[PDB]
Amino acid sequence: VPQPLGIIAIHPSRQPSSPNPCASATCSHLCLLSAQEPRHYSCACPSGWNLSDDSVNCVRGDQPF
Amino acid sequence: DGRTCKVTASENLLLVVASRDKIIMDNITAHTHNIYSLVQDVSFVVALDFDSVTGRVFWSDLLEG
Ligand SMILES: *[C@@H]1O[C@H](CO)[C@@H](O)[C@H](O)[C@H]1NC(C)=O
Numbered sequence: 716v717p718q719p720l721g722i723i724a725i726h727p728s729r730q731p732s733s734p735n736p737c738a739s740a741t742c743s744h745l746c747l748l749s750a751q752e753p754r755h756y757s758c759a760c761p762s763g764w765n766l767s768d769d770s771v772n773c774v775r776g777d778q779p780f
Numbered sequence: 781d782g783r784t785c786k787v788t789a790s791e792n793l794l795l796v797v798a799s800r801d802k803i804i805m806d807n808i809t810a811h812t813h814n815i816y817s818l819v820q821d822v823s824f825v826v827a828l829d830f831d832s833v834t835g836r837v838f839w840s841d842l843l844e845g
């Protein structure tokens with residue numbers, strides 16, 4: 716194999732099933748799994764945005780960069 | 781032997797490697813290797829990841845960016 720930079724294995728055993736915390740969420744940009752309890756989920760806005768006290772919504776920019 | 785573990789889903793395994801122009805794929809049926817190429821139009825594959833929910837393969841290319 717001349718240039719084997721990456722390798723992956725594809726079986727049903729390598730991606731074990733688990734319940735999804737994010738399915739219950741409704742935040743407007745991203746939902747990410749989180750080790751913190753009890754929600755086990757958190758929401759993330761695009762790079763440069765803020766996150767409102769309303770943890771499911773985001774605000775954008777309004778400051779020089 | 782009461783110590784070894786095996787997979788319920790068939791033992792058949794799919795192994796994918798990234799080598800420049802080819803996303804080499806190996807299919808281990810029984811212990812016989814079967815080798816074929818997933819895609820013709822790729823330039824320089826670096827990173828390979830597998831998604832079991834859609835049944836898809838993801839790869840990144842150094843030349844195509
Ligand atoms: C979020 O808003 C505050 C003003 O309330 C601002 O100072 C801050 O820079 C914004 N986000 C970041 C971390 O840039």
Ligand SMILES: *[C@@H]1O[C@H](CO)[C@@H](O)[C@H](O)[C@H]1NC(C)=O
Pocket residue numbers: 792793794807808809
């Ligand atoms: C691997 O090879 C077997 C036999 O050719 C085939 O039935 C199977 O679909 C191939 N792919 C996977 C993921 O098992």
